[PDB]
Structure 1
Amino acid sequence: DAPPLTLEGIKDRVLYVLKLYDKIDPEKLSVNSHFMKDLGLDSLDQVEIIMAMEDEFGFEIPDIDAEKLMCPQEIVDYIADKKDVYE
């Protein structure tokens, strides 16, 4: 029970499940994008996104962090911290 994770792979999987989400566009979907400034979605659907990451990868993230991710790059960084992603 050890499939190897990598940074490009986790980036692709997180961007896949963000692009599959409804009320964003596949055009203006950047890695360095805000969940507050440019995507314009609210805190509620932001924590729906946080729930999507928790339900995909298989672990909770605490609410001391769920205040303050707000961008996909720090999402990738935080699952990189939970998983310690090197071979």
Structure 2
Amino acid sequence: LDGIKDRVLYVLKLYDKIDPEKLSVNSHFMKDLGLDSLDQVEIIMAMEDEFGFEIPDIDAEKLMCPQEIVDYIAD
């Protein structure tokens, strides 16, 4: 259950245009990181490749929280 957060944290910092040590689970891609709308899209996609599950077009819109992403991936 945390293992998901372990993978999700690894994916966010690897792209390197985000989380320069400011990575936080409560941190929101759009709300505080400032990462672009599109960049988020890239992120969700990224998570999909490591998880091995492709999340839908819409639910990407609701999760801007790495912790919430782990919430959904566990489901």
TM-score category by the smaller chain? 0.7 to 0.9
Change (3 A) 1:70 1:25: closer
Q: Which protein has the bigger helix share?
A: 2
**CA deviations over 1:38-58 (Å, ceiling 9, x no partner):** 100111110100111111111
Q: Which has the larger radius of gyration?
A: 1
Give the TM-score taking structure 1 as reference length. Answer: 0.77
The runs of 4+ residues in structure 1 deviating greater than 2 Å are: none
Instruction: Structure 1 unaligned segments of length 5 or more: list them.
Output: 1-6, 81-86
**CA RMSD after TM alignment:** 1.9
Give the TM-score taking structure 2 as reference length. Answer: 0.88
Q: How many equivalent pairs are there?
A: 75
1:37 Cα shift?
Answer: 1.8
1:14 Cα shift?
Answer: 0.7
Instruction: Structure 2 unaligned segments of length 5 or more: list them.
Output: none
**CA deviations over 1:13-55 (Å, ceiling 9, x no partner):** 1101111121123421111101112100111110100111111
